[PDB]
Amino acid sequence: ISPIFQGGSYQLNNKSIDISSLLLDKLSGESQTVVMKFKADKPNSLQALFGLSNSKAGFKNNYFSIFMRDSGEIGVEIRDAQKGINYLFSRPASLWGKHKGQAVENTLVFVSDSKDKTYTMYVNGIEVFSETVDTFLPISNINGIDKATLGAVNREGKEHYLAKGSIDEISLFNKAISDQEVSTIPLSNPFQLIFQSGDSTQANYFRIPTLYTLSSGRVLSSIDARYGGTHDSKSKINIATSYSDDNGKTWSEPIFAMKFNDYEEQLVYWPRDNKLKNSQISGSASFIDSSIVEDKKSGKTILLADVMPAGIGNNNANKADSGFKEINGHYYLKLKKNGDNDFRYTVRENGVVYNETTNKPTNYTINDKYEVLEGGKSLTVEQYSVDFDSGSLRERHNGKQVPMNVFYKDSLFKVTPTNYIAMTTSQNRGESWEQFKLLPPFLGEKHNGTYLCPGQGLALKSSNRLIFATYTSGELTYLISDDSGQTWKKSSASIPFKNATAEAQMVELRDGVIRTFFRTTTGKIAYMTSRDSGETWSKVSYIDGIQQTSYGTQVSAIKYSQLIDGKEAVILSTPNSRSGRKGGQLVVGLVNKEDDSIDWKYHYDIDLPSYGYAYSAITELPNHHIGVLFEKYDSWSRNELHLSNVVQYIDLEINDLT
Ligand SMILES: O=S(=O)(O)CCNCc1ccco1
């Protein structure tokens, strides 16, 4: 239908604008829709963009506001002292500030709907909240409203929450518009979604993005499709992938690289109240932290991830147990049968389940998908679903039968409650993925598996050598294959930390010279150098000019192909902050051929220093633009848990950085 009111080009310079004379008489009925295109790249800590208030003395709490914080959060307030109603709905990390230097125009759509009794907010096409109340307060039935304000809320005749930005365009409607209509509002988005709520993964949440340009020009991406909110394992998490054949302008409908079936794939809205936000899926096996490379020789595409048996994450993973028993040079996967309190079985050659005590093989075997067969017959378990209908989290058998897998809770045979690493391959560049294979122990029979560094593995330009960085207590443990991933050898590089999350990423500065940048506990990014193609490693140094937080953040890096100011160039993606995971940057370094030192010459501000930026993926797109897929939020912050569509992708050019 038609806007009862429409205005545009409002400047918010810490002075509010009065539009009462225009809007207040238009307002009628109990349903309204605000549509607001606005810019704010230098906002104050807390500012109101829009306000409906009772400016009369004695009614400071009778108002409606649409506000933002300089954290990127957006919210509304609906308050009536006489009615006894005080509503505040919001979401962190809902905004953009700047992109490529210019300020971003955000597209805000707030719906107030008296039929479903529901407040819904969309920003830049994404639904950031939708709240139902039992007692609905139409934004226009607030007692004694006499003001309509932009850039403030007019309380008791003063300008509260003074704003800094602009509203290019604002429309008002005496209707609550439908979803379908909402989707037809044009956007000015500086970004796109590759993975997103409601897509084929059915995961409502995503974390830990990766990017890799393949030899065909196809760009591939892998990610954590996280179902139980944005929690680490333990949870349900699958590895999803999607590709682009047109330099990241469009992306394929995602498919699974690694998935488990013990729990259903459920698009669940996870509770954000303090009483319930730490609810965590506790019976599911899961995957977490993927890394990808292309192998020249085979043409194969290779993906690794951490594997977690039902109910397992890194905080409770059995350290001091690789999950394998060594029998004469060979590592065998161990199993526990129900009723036993010790592990008495192994998976020998041809997946035969052998009893270690009796020394007789058994009538059970383990297939390639780690499913259990008895006497050649496939066994099954019942699937679980999660819900919050009882007011708290509840995992329960949903009726469906799925292949019994030794990583599952209900399995008759179970692996060691510890962390594993697995690989899968694609012969077709992301179109399908093989059944994953578990990797062997690297640091011993009685030492838990290491942790895959998420992002890219490295394909050395002058051999068939493939390296995947992993970490454990006290060292990076690089995994090396010279045979297209069929076999693997470890290369240990000690670091001066214990229990650090040393997420690492490598660049080749020239033939056989590998620089790795990894996350520390120091507030600085560290690095080390191999000069014999990852055989041995230098001592640890640190970069000054970038700061991280004490707990740090994942860092992605690539060796750029074109020269920049005449030099070889390495690009770096990281939050630059000591407060939290915000202030994202791409940092450009020129290499000094004399000594292989790096002069970090350019810093690109991805967005505002106060807006969230966490784990990231960069890649050189086939047209020499830079593709960036990142967590646009503070994935550490306890206040920013469980947001949808905060992992976003952008296209940058080199000159944008310089
Ligand atoms: O810093 S955070 O990214 O929030 C924590 C990530 N933990 C990494 C991990 C690896 C295996 C299980 O968890």
Q: Is 634 a pocket residue for ligand 1 (Cβ < 6 Å)? A: no
Contact 453, 504 (CB under 8 A): yes
d(CA 160, CA 47): 8
d(CA 497, CA 214): 35
Give the domain ranges of the chain: 1-190, 191-319+418-658, 320-417
Q: Tell me the C-alpha to C-alpha distance, in Å, between residue 14 and each of 66, 337, 380.
A: 16, 69, 65
**To which H or E segment does residue 654 belong?**
helix 654-657
- CA 170–ligand 1 middle distance (angstroms): 42
Closest by CA to 238, choosing from 219, 223, 254, is 223
258: amino acid identity, one letter: M
Q: Which residues pair with 290 in a beta bridge?
A: 305
Alpha helices in 11-152 (DSSP H): 20-23
- CA 76–ligand 1 middle distance (angstroms): 33
Contact 480, 534 (CB under 8 A): yes
Q: Give me 25's structure tokens.
A: 């008489």
Q: Give me 208's structure tokens.
A: 């830990």
Contact 82, 143 (CB under 8 A): yes
Q: Is 548 a pocket residue for ligand 1 (Cβ < 6 Å)? A: no
Q: Tokens 């500065």 map to which residue?
A: 509
d(CA 158, CA 80): 18
Count of other CB atoms within 10 angstroms of residue 249 = 10
Ligand 1 binding pocket mutation candidate from 234, 418, 501 (most atoms within 8 A of CB): 501
Q: Where are the beta strands (DSSP E) in 420-503?
A: 420-426, 437-438, 451-452, 455-456, 458-459, 466-468, 470-472, 475-481, 489-494
Q: Whose CA is nearest to atom 6 of ligand 1?
A: 232
Q: Whose CA is nearest to atom 11 of ligand 1?
A: 314
Is 87 known to be catalytic? no
The secondary structure of residue 31, as a DSSP letter, is: -
Closest by CA to 419, choosing from 560, 579, 232, is 232
d(CA 598, CA 95): 34
226 annotated as ligand-binding: no
- State the Cα torsion 392-397-402-403 to the nearest 10°: 90
Domain 191-319+418-658 fold is: Neuraminidase (2.120.10)
d(CA 403, CA 470): 31
Q: Is 631 a pocket residue for ligand 1 (Cβ < 6 Å)? A: no
Q: Which residues pair with 428 in a beta bridge?
A: none
Closest by CA to 609, choosing from 98, 104, 124, is 98
Is 232 known to be catalytic? yes
In the chain, DSSP finds a helix count (H) and a strand count (E) of 3, 53
Q: Tell me the C-alpha to C-alpha distance, in Å, between residue 633 and each of 305, 501, 606.
A: 23, 19, 12
Q: Is 232 a pocket residue for ligand 1 (Cβ < 6 Å)? A: yes
123: amino acid identity, one letter: V
69 annotated as ligand-binding: no
d(CA 399, CA 408): 16
CB-based burial label for 395 (10 Å; 0-12, 13-18, 19+): middle
Q: Give me 223's structure tokens.
A: 């990610």
CATH superfamily of 320-417: Intramolecular Trans-sialidase; Domain 3 (2.40.220.10)
End-to-end CA distance of the chain: 46
Contact 81, 143 (CB under 8 A): yes
Most distant pair of Cα atoms in the chain: their distance: 90
Closest ligand 1 atom to Cα of 636: 4
- CA 432–ligand 1 middle distance (angstroms): 27
Q: Where are the beta strands (DSSP E) in 114-236?
A: 118-123, 126-132, 147-150, 153-155, 158-160, 164-173, 205-207, 212-213, 219-226
Alpha helices in 78-210 (DSSP H): 179-183
Peptide bond into 147 cis (omega under 30): no
476, HSE (Cβ side, Cα atoms, 13 Å) = 32
- CA 230–ligand 1 middle distance (angstroms): 11
Q: Give me 161's structure tokens.
A: 């929450």
Q: Tokens 């594993």 map to which residue?
A: 420
- CA 551–ligand 1 middle distance (angstroms): 11
Q: Are strands 32-39 and 164-173 parallel, antiparallel or unpaired?
A: antiparallel
- State the Cα torsion 372-375-380-381 to the nearest 10°: -70
Is 615 known to be catalytic? yes
CB-based burial label for 242 (10 Å; 0-12, 13-18, 19+): buried
Domain 1-190 fold is: Jelly Rolls (2.60.120)
Q: Is 313 a pocket residue for ligand 1 (Cβ < 6 Å)? A: yes
Contact 107, 185 (CB under 8 A): yes
- CA 632–ligand 1 middle distance (angstroms): 17
Task: State residue 122 phi and psi, 5-degree precision.
Answer: -120, 140
Count of other CB atoms within 10 angstroms of residue 565 = 11
Q: Whose CA is nearest to atom 9 of ligand 1?
A: 314
552: amino acid identity, one letter: G
Q: Whose CA is nearest to atom 4 of ligand 1?
A: 636
Closest by CA to 411, choosing from 468, 353, 466, is 353
Closest ligand 1 atom to Cα of 452: 10
- CA 553–ligand 1 middle distance (angstroms): 10
The one catalytic residue among 105, 232, 294, 306: 232
d(CA 346, CA 355): 7
**To which H or E segment does residue 9 belong?**
strand 5-13
Count of other CB atoms within 10 angstroms of residue 115 = 9
Q: Is 420 a pocket residue for ligand 1 (Cβ < 6 Å)? A: no
Q: Do domains 191-319+418-658 and 320-417 have the same CATH topology?
A: no
d(CA 606, CA 574): 10
Rg (CA), the chain: 27
Contact 293, 215 (CB under 8 A): no
Q: Whose CA is nearest to atom 7 of ligand 1?
A: 232
d(CA 64, CA 175): 17
- The resolution of the experimental structure, rounded to one decimal in Å, is 2.7
Closest by CA to 456, choosing from 523, 524, 514, is 514
348 annotated as ligand-binding: no
The secondary structure of residue 22, as a DSSP letter, is: H
Q: Is 503 a pocket residue for ligand 1 (Cβ < 6 Å)? A: no
Contact 147, 25 (CB under 8 A): no
Contact 587, 579 (CB under 8 A): no
**To which H or E segment does residue 655 belong?**
helix 654-657
Give me the count of residues in the chain.
658
Q: Is 633 a pocket residue for ligand 1 (Cβ < 6 Å)? A: no
d(CA 397, CA 411): 14
d(CA 629, CA 620): 12
d(CA 323, CA 331): 9
Q: Give me 275's structure tokens.
A: 């009483």
- CA 640–ligand 1 middle distance (angstroms): 16
Q: Give me 135's structure tokens.
A: 């007692």
Q: Is 640 a pocket residue for ligand 1 (Cβ < 6 Å)? A: no
Ligand 1 binding pocket mutation candidate from 208, 237, 289 (most atoms within 8 A of CB): 289
Q: Is 322 a pocket residue for ligand 1 (Cβ < 6 Å)? A: no
Q: Tokens 């307030």 map to which residue?
A: 77
From which experimental method does this structure derive?
A: X-ray
Q: Give me 515's structure tokens.
A: 């620089």
The one catalytic residue among 73, 321, 503, 620: 503
Coil/strand/helix, residue 284: coil
